Amino acid sequence: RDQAGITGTWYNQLGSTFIVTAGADGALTGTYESAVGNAESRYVLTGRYDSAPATDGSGTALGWTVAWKNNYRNAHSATTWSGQYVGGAEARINTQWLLTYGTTEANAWWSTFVGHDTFTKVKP
Amino acid sequence: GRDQAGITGTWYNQLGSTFIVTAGADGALTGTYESAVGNAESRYVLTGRYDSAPATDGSGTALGWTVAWKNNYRNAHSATTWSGQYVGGAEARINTQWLLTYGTTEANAWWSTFVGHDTFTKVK
Amino acid sequence: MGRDQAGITGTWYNQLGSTFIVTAGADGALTGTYESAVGNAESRYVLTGRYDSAPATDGSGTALGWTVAWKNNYRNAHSATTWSGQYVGGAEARINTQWLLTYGTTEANAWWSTFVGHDTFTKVK
Amino acid sequence: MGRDQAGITGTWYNQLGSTFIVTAGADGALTGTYESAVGNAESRYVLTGRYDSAPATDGSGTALGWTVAWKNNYRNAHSATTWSGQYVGGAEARINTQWLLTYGTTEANAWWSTFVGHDTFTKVK
Numbered sequence A: 001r002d003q004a005g006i007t008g009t010w011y012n013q014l015g016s017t018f019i020v021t022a023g024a025d026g027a028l029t030g031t032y033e034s035a036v037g038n039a040e041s042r043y044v045l046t047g048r049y050d051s052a053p054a055t056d057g058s059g060t061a062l063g064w065t066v067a068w069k070n071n072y073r074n075a076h077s078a079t080t081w082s083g084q085y086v087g088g089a090e091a092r093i094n095t096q097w098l099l100t101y102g103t104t105e106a107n108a109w110w111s112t113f114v115g116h117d118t119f120t121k122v123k124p
Numbered sequence B: 001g002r003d004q005a006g007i008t009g010t011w012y013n014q015l016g017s018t019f020i021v022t023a024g025a026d027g028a029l030t031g032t033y034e035s036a037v038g039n040a041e042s043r044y045v046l047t048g049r050y051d052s053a054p055a056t057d058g059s060g061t062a063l064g065w066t067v068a069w070k071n072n073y074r075n076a077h078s079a080t081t082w083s084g085q086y087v088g089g090a091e092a093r094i095n096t097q098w099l100l101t102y103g104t105t106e107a108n109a110w111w112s113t114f115v116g117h118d119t120f121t122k123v124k
Numbered sequence C, D: 001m002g003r004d005q006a007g008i009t010g011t012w013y014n015q016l017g018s019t020f021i022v023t024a025g026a027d028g029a030l031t032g033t034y035e036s037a038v039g040n041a042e043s044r045y046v047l048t049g050r051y052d053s054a055p056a057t058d059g060s061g062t063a064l065g066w067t068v069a070w071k072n073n074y075r076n077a078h079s080a081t082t083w084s085g086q087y088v089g090g091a092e093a094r095i096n097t098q099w100l101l102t103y104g105t106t107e108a109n110a111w112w113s114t115f116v117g118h119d120t121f122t123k124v125k
Ligand SMILES: O=C(CCCC[C@@H]1SC[C@@H]2NC(=O)N[C@@H]21)Nc1cccc(S)c1
Pocket: A012, A014, A016, A033, A034, A035, A036, A037, A038, A039, A068, A075, A076, A077, A079, A097, A099, A101, A113, A115, A117, D111, D112
């Protein structure tokens, strides 16, 4: 339903690139390249979306994860984005995210960052 | 993967939910989640990522995963992402924070996302 | 005394159409009223919070937060929101926040007691 | 006047060993001091917040929140924390919270300005 719509190349307000393919079964797979932080080149992402959403004008729920390890860098961290795809003229993926990095137990209290990313198909 | 063995297997949270996961050598997480609460019945597909080469200073291993709450029985038009870290040892744990987003209209988007925290252990 | 006391004091507006009226004290206090354009809210609610009255000099923002409990002389939504964020000065002064809204639940329902979001405030509607 | 005014008023301790000393006013006010056992913090910091002074009578918790800006006479960590949560009274009284900690950043570093966590406070040390 929203498979073709979600599938494609997305950019957030930071200039990050999210290249994703939505599967018929609810899979999300692709690559993420962050414009910020301890990150270089593309990282693997996987996630899930609701492949049969409400038809009442509601968005499509989805989420995905990046672990920040590739051949170039390892930031000992993972980000999860949770949010919704909104179709139509101004297609957009509005998210909140959590970034956890590996800490000792004594440091676990400041292990997790929160933020928000909005993605569109136009590079801003 | 340094914790591929420690992570793979069955986990239980404070609410009585069950998470079965395989951790791949390449940083993949795949499995199923069965929730003890909410609009949830039976198992749901889970996918995520973990750091397959963590620090060796006693830091945890960062990870995350997504469940979209659609299976053959039920569709709650929502998805949860868990972001956290695995901590090995006698009392292995996965400590997470999570975001649950449900599909909303634009007018209801301000209240589309819940936040919480779950701790998983290997013992029921 | 307070470095951004002048910049923060006044009326702010968010992306929802809500209105935040605040006074920053020299001692770090935030006092004022919040009027929400959405939810189980009517008219103005008391707000109280704190800000860093001696921020860093290097162009960093000024950290702040405040709370609104959603009870007033009209309604009681058995809930409270906290906003955490920073004030950025200049033209297009802004207060960029993340928020948590907790509502009172039984223990059985506490897992879904807390919403999260983000609000941006500017001096112009 | 407040339903849980006496229940909330007093000293609370979290899982980190931090100490929260609070007075609940009749009108919904929270005032007091916070002393963190961790981070760039020393001694007591001013807190202010709000609680629902007339909660539901169905065994629901009492929604509340408060803010600390991490500046006192000893130290300034250019940051503020807000706790959003609920009070549950009775045998083992507890305040269960989620929190947001924002530190002052430049605009380029704003994306990593806010930490999130959860604290549970009880009356015992
Ligand atoms: O820097 C990294 C790795 C890359 C994160 C990129 C983030 S993910 C959310 C946001 N959205 C984007 O597009 N980019 C940013 N990890 C790390 C480790 C320890 C502390 C901190 S702050 C960060």
